[PDB]
Design a protein around this ligand. Sequence first.
Ligand code: HEM
Ligand SMILES: Oc1c(Cl)cc(Cl)cc1Cl
Length: 137
Amino acid sequence: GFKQDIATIRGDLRTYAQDIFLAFLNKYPDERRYFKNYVGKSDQELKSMAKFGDHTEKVFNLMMEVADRATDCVPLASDANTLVQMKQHSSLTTGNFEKFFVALVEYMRASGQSFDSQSWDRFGKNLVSALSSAGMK
Ligand code: HEM
Ligand SMILES: Oc1c(Cl)cc(Cl)cc1Cl
């Protein structure tokens, strides 16, 4: 289930974080514009820029912390607030996060593994609702 998925992802956090982030950028290429240093790089090229692996790991670490603190896939309002307030997320709307979760859920469904993809889909929806509540446009 969802708790075990957190453990699976944590076990190989950098690999999952990179793969899922790449699935996101490749599904939604317009989103690459927010990451000016990643423009004009292939999958394998990004996997060699320091900030890429370190970025992705840090993002997914936070995501895992938010997922672990959630109850029944509902995130804490305090965690949504953090996400809205981050200077790095100042130009974002909920639609950016919707895209993120669509990519993540698609990745999990395509995986050979027994991810609880329905719970990640719900988590994402619940997080998007909490982001709006916390004032994200
Ligand atoms: C639940 C989803 C997300 C979480 C947990 C999250 C978390 C983070 C964290 C921790 C950082 C800081 C990384 C660091 O300084 O090393 C970061 C930076 C950033 N986030 Fe997110 N984020 C999420 C979704 C998004 C989405 C959907 C976008 C855009 C589509 C986005 C755009 C960025 C940008 C542009 C940066 C700055 C990258 C840089 O340092 O150049 N984030 N985010
Ligand atoms: O920074 C991101 C990561 Cl590491 C993964 C995805 Cl799915 C999307 C975002 Cl914007």
